[PDB]
Amino acid sequence: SPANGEPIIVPSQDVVLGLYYMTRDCVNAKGEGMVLTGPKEAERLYRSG
Amino acid sequence: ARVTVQDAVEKIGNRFDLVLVAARRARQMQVGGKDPLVPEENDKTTVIALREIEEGLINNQILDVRERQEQQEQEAAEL
Amino acid sequence: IKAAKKMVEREEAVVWDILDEVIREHPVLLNRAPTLHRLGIQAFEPVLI
Amino acid sequence: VTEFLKPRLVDIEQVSSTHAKVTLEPLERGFGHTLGNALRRILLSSMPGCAVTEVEIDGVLHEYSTKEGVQEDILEILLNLKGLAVRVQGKDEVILTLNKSGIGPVTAADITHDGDVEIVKPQHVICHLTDENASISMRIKVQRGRGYVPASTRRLLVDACYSPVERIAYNVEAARVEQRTDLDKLVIEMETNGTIDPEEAIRRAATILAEQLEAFVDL
Amino acid sequence: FLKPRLVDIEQVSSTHAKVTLEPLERGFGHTLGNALRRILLSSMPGCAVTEVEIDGVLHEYSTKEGVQEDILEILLNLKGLAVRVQGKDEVILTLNKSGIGPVTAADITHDGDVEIVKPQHVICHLTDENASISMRIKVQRGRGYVPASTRIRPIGRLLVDACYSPVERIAYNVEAARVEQRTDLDKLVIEMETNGTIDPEEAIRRAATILAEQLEAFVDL
Amino acid sequence: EIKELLKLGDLPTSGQIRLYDGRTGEQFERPVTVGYMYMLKLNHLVDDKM
Amino acid sequence: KPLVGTGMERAVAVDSGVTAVAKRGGVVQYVDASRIVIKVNEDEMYPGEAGIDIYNLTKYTRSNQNTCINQMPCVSLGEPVERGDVLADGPSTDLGELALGQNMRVAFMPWNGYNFEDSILVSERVVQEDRFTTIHIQELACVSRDTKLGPEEITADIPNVGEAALSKLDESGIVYIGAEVTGGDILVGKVTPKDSSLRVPNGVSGTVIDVQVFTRDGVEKDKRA
RNA sequence: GCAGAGGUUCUAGCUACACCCUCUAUAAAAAACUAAGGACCACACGA
């Protein structure tokens, strides 16, 4: 944006809530402490439940 | 098709000279008989001009060179 | 132009695929009515929906 | 009444032999998702396919330890085993013996051939050795199970990657037919370990799903 | 991989009935459940009416005399007429009710092939013994939802909306059946809710058939 | 009062159900509110403004 | 009806003129989609020359905002009504209550951004069951002016028009009641002395329910009139 | 096809933004076709 160096194309309200729900932590959740072989394995684990 | 213009402006780095040169090039490629010196992929003249720019082939001085070459070839057949 | 007007007024199937042909790389200026900053009128490659 | 448009593998623009991108022609609305999700569940859920399931390190016995020369932690010489894509035919519970000393990485090519057991990534660097004297060894037991199963469900146990596929993602999007309003263009972008081709992975998943439908198959 | 097979079509009613498959392998439970539910709700051959012809009514917004209901909501009632065909793909049904009394769907002068499944579905209330509704109801086949406009002629024709969707509510519920001696064979049930025009067994048969046919897009036979 | 009315029917008191997804066919975590809001339809249609 | 109202919607639906209220209690002698005949009870009878009280309902009539001012009888042949009762549910009314919109299952969750900021995401089930369809009544006035050398005459004798143009028109230049007219179609002749036919403005579509032909004295009504 | 007229249709059609052919003072063998269009104030609002 020409007003300030802050970008104007910013995730506004819903996508940011989804990301916050994604990028968070609860000390007890199904399959915690597992060791992953890369982010692709993390996606495979989550989509398999 | 294409999305951005940064790879185009980076060599014409006024972001306004880009518009003028690619506009006259798209003119010579649309109303003129010139064929695109960059492969065409069902893309309009504007993105074709941008692609011809990004490939380091079409710039302001190159366009002037083409114009005066056409002028010389025209006046060579008139003599 | 009379024949073209008739063809586009009937919106034949030969008109839709030609339209999607002419909107390949043709930006359109979206615009909000109470525009204040210059980020209030951008352009996009319109997709026919 | 029953006429339904069917695509024919319209775009199979495979990037690399371990990552393809299948994109079908427009399908009737409500079918792009019903096929993408079905294939996703089949692929992330269950296919025949061999992978490591457990390993007995010769010198190391606890899940949390470390032996000199191997700067990689034993937990990491376990992740690299999860990444060890292995294909076997006929034999199921085959045990692979790894044995190498000397400075340098332990490539997957160092595992002895052990009959018809093939490794698709010979240059898979499991762990690095910094000492000539250190002779690392183990008995990695691969198995041709069906579908992913972690170690928490069930000598050192490692998670299993029985499914040859590693990443399934279908991003269905609208397509067009000359009159039809909105038909969905399914886009399956999918990776694999390399043991089975991505196109072949999709074909085998479709085969499994169809074979689970043969009872009610007609015409 | 054990294949699923129909084992129960328990007809809890005429409007709806659950269909259960005894064996299903781990993971395939919800897979088949969601696939079948989606393919049933989306695409199943319906029979809802498509065109009505009142006797002395020109446009659908007119009001015939004697009927306690205006023509528009008579059509609104008709678009949910639970009817099914067996031999035809389109049929024109004639109705001639006379005298005071609600016009139940049983009054439709049906043939041997086209048979209604809800003979109590009231269409309109006649409120005069000297007034008589007369409808030439056109019934077609089809699938999904088709509005009046998006179907490409005389004055009397009233183009009603189409609702070719025999199923109204599908809900699968995987379970745990201890088949033989192998555990984890998740028994699957389909608490489908049709409108009485499609056999639940035949509904599942056709849904699986279309799923296979469209899945044969990338596989040999 | 609204809680007791909910509990009279064979409905959860918390007012939230576990809406299974229509496409993935998988349970939504964090059970979501479901109820019958009285939605109007405003006169500002689109076919008179397209 | 609103599944959760305020109890006073009945008051706002009876006080307004939308709902034909029973100014005289009695038993419904003859109900119809157009008229309601009320047989007055003995107690509410006028002394002599008594009888019935015909509540002549108003069917589809153009509103001011081009909505359907429609009335539906909510009673049957033989159901008693009392003073101040409600007989015909007008526009956006149900059994005497006020029902502006409808009600359907609503779930509060982000569903793949389609309800991103404030947008609703209605199901195809709403449209399929014809839940939110709204009648809109448009009006197309057309006049016949005192033009020199012959006035404006409404005749089907339109020139430079094919049989498609004369299809929806009658033999006197006026469209039949109930023709599925669409954009550009002709409805009224209005031949001017030398073709000023009132045609459907582009975009608007749908049936034509009623044509009214006013006429001042001094000119004879044509065939459709 | 640039200044006019005529032609097979349908009063009239010469590029009027406009559609075919002829020539510079003469009218017909010929199918697809036609019209250049409209101001100011009050009110309900909506973003």
Residues in E closer than 8 angstroms to D28, CB to CB, are 42-43
- By C-alpha distance, the chain E residue nearest G34 is E63
Q: Of E67, E59, E97, which is closest to residue G35 (Cα–Cα)?
A: E67
Q: Of E166, E136, E159, which is closest to residue E72 (Cα–Cα)?
A: E159
**Contacting residues for E30 by C-beta, under 8 A, at least 6 apart:** D41, E172, E174, F25, F26
Confirm if D136 and D69 have CB atoms less than 8 A apart. yes
Strand H contact at CB of residue C5, distance < 7 A: no
Q: What is the DSSP string of E107-153?
A: GSB--SS-EES-TT----EE--TT---EEEEEEE---S-B-SSS---
Q: Which two tokens stand for residue G73?
A: 């009888």
Cα-trace Rg, chain B? 13
Q: Of A26, A42, A44, A25, which is closest to residue A34 (Cα–Cα)?
A: A42
CA of G225 to C1' of H4 (A): 49
Q: Which two tokens stand for residue E128?
A: 């005069």
Q: What is the DSSP string of G159-224?
A: SS--HHHHHHB-TTSBBPTT----TT-EEE--BPP----EEPPTT--S----------TTS---S-
Is E198 in a helix, a strand, or coil? coil
The CATH number of the domain holding residue E104 is 2.170.120.12
Confirm if G158 and G165 have CB atoms less than 8 A apart. yes
Confirm if D55 and D138 have CB atoms less than 8 A apart. yes
Cα–Cα distance between E13 and E18 in angstroms, integer? 9
Task: List, in sequence order, the alpha helices (H) in chain E.
Answer: 28-42, 71-78, 200-215
- Compute the count of residue pairs across chains D and E with CB atoms less than 8 Å apart: 121
Confirm if E93 and E101 have CB atoms less than 8 A apart. no
H or E element, residue A27: none
Angle between the D32-45 and E200-215 helix axes, to the nearest 10 degrees? 80
CA of G217 to C1' of H36 (A): 39
Within 7 Å of a protein beta carbon, the nucleotides of strand H are 10-11, 18-19, 33-35, 46-47
Strand H contact at CB of residue C22, distance < 7 A: no
Q: Of D90, D91, D107, D88, which is closest to residue D99 (Cα–Cα)?
A: D107
Confirm if G125 and G105 have CB atoms less than 8 A apart. no
Contact status of G119 with chain F (Cβ, < 8 Å): no
Cα–Cα distance between G130 and G132 in angstroms, integer? 6
Cα–Cα distance between G87 and G23 in angstroms, integer? 10
Strand H contact at CB of residue G119, distance < 7 A: no
Contact check, Cβ <8 Å, E30/F23? no
H or E element, residue B28: helix B17-30
Residues of D in CB contact (< 8 Å) with F are 33-34, 37
Length of chain E as a residue count: 221
Burial class (CB in 10 A: 0-12, 13-18, 19+), D126: buried
Q: Of D164, D163, D107, which is closest to residue D136 (Cα–Cα)?
A: D107
CA of C2 to C1' of H15 (A): 15
Confirm if D160 and D145 have CB atoms less than 8 A apart. yes
Q: Measure the CA angle with vertex G56, ends G54 and G57; round to 5°.
A: 140
CA of G196 to C1' of H35 (A): 13
Cα–Cα distance between G39 and G30 in angstroms, integer? 8
Distance from CA of G25 to the nearest CA of F (A): 33
Cα–Cα distance between G9 and G5 in angstroms, integer? 7
Strand H contact at CB of residue C38, distance < 7 A: no
Domains contained in chain B, number: 1
Task: List, in sequence order, the alpha helices (H) in chain D.
Answer: 32-45, 76-82, 198-211
Please, what sign has the CA dihedral across residues E80, E84, E90, E96? negative
Minimum CA–C1' distance nucleotide for C6: H33
Q: Of E125, E127, E107, E129, which is closest to residue E66 (Cα–Cα)?
A: E127
* φ, ψ for residue E135, nearest 5 deg: -125, 130
Strand H contact at CB of residue F49, distance < 7 A: no
Burial class (CB in 10 A: 0-12, 13-18, 19+), G218: exposed
Cα–Cα distance between D213 and E208 in angstroms, integer? 6
The CATH number of the domain holding residue B23 is 3.90.940.10
Distance from CA of E143 to the nearest CA of F (A): 19
- Strand E6-8 to strand D187-192: parallel, antiparallel, or no bridges (unpaired)? unpaired
SS3 content of chain B, % helix, strand, coil (to 5): 55, 0, 45
Q: Of G162, G152, G150, which is closest to residue G222 (Cα–Cα)?
A: G152
Residues of the domain holding B56? 5-78
DSSP A9: -
Strand H contact at CB of residue C47, distance < 7 A: no
Cα–Cα distance between G187 and G174 in angstroms, integer? 6
Cα–Cα distance between D42 and D202 in angstroms, integer? 10
- Each residue of F14-43: b (16+ CB within 10 Å) or e? eeeeeebeebbbeeeeeeeebbeebeeeee
Cα-trace Rg, chain E? 21
Cα G80 from chain centroid (whole Å): 28
Cα–Cα distance between E214 and E208 in angstroms, integer? 10
Strand H contact at CB of residue C2, distance < 7 A: yes
Is G54 in a helix, a strand, or coil? strand
Cα–Cα distance between G63 and E144 in angstroms, integer? 35
User: Edge-to-edge, what's the strand order for the sheet holding E19-21?
Assistant: E6-8, E19-21, E188-190, E172-174
Strand H contact at CB of residue C3, distance < 7 A: yes
Query: Alpha carbon of E27 to those of A32, D155, G169, G196: distances in Å?
Result: 21, 29, 65, 71
Out of G31, G130, G207, name the one closest to residue E79 (CB).
G130
Contact check, Cβ <8 Å, A15/G113? yes
User: Edge-to-edge, what's the strand order for the sheet holding D183-185?
Assistant: D27-28, D183-185, D173-175
Q: What is the DSSP string of G14-48?
A: HHSTTSEEESS-EEEEEE-SSEEEEEE-STT--SS
* φ, ψ for residue C15, nearest 5 deg: -85, -35
**Contacting residues for G60 by C-beta, under 8 A, at least 6 apart:** E61, G68, G69, G70, G135, G137, G209
Amino acid (one-letter) located at G204: V
- Each residue of E102-130: b (16+ CB within 10 Å) or e? bbebebbebeeebebbbeebebbbbbbee
Please, what sign has the CA dihedral across residues D191, D194, D197, D202? negative
CA of G189 to C1' of H6 (A): 35
Cα G161 from chain centroid (whole Å): 32
Q: Of E140, E138, E142, which is closest to residue E158 (Cα–Cα)?
A: E138
Cα A36 from chain centroid (whole Å): 16
**Contacting residues for D72 by C-beta, under 8 A, at least 6 apart:** D80, D126, D127, D128
**Contacting residues for E97 by C-beta, under 8 A, at least 6 apart:** E103, E107, E126, E132, E133
Cα–Cα distance between D87 and G140 in angstroms, integer? 77
Cα–Cα distance between B29 and B46 in angstroms, integer? 10
Q: Which two tokens stand for residue F8?
A: 């009279």
Query: Alpha carbon of E98 to those of B59, E131, E207: distances in Å?
Result: 86, 6, 42
Contact check, Cβ <8 Å, D1/E89? yes
Judging contact as 3 or more Cβ pairs under 8 Å, the answer for E and D is yes
Cα–Cα distance between C18 and C15 in angstroms, integer? 5
Confirm if E15 and E105 have CB atoms less than 8 A apart. no
Minimum CA–C1' distance nucleotide for C34: H47
CA of G152 to C1' of H10 (A): 23
Resolution, Å (one decimal): 3.7
Strand H contact at CB of residue C33, distance < 7 A: yes
Cα-trace Rg, chain A? 16
Contact status of D178 with chain C (Cβ, < 8 Å): yes
**Contacting residues for G102 by C-beta, under 8 A, at least 6 apart:** F38, F39, F41, G131, G132
Residues of D in CB contact (< 8 Å) with E are 1-2, 4, 6-9, 22, 24, 27-31, 33-35, 37-38, 41-42, 45-46, 147, 181, 202-203, 206-219
Confirm if G54 and G37 have CB atoms less than 8 A apart. yes
Residue with tokens 């999007």: D173
Cα–Cα distance between D52 and D143 in angstroms, integer? 6
Residues 146-175 of D with CB under 8 A from A: 148, 150-152, 159, 161, 163, 165-169
H or E element, residue G53: strand G52-56
Cα–Cα distance between D36 and D190 in angstroms, integer? 11
Q: What is the 3-state secondary structure (H, E, C) of G129-169?
A: CCCCCCCCCCCCCCCCCCCCCCCCECCCCCCCCCHHHHHHE
- Each residue of E24-44: b (16+ CB within 10 Å) or e? bbebbbbbbbbbbbbbbbbbb
- Strand G85-89 to strand G72-73: parallel, antiparallel, or no bridges (unpaired)? antiparallel
Amino acid (one-letter) located at D75: L
Confirm if B63 and B24 have CB atoms less than 8 A apart. yes
**Contacting residues for D196 by C-beta, under 8 A, at least 6 apart:** D49, D87, D164, D204
Cα–Cα distance between F3 and E198 in angstroms, integer? 40
* φ, ψ for residue C37, nearest 5 deg: -90, 165
Number of H helices, E strands in chain F: 1, 2
DSSP F24: S
Confirm if G71 and G89 have CB atoms less than 8 A apart. yes
CA of C27 to C1' of H2 (A): 38
Angle between the B45-54 and B17-30 helix axes, to the nearest 10 degrees? 120
Residue A41 CB neighbours (<10 A): 20
Confirm if D190 and D20 have CB atoms less than 8 A apart. yes
Residues of the domain holding E139? 49-159
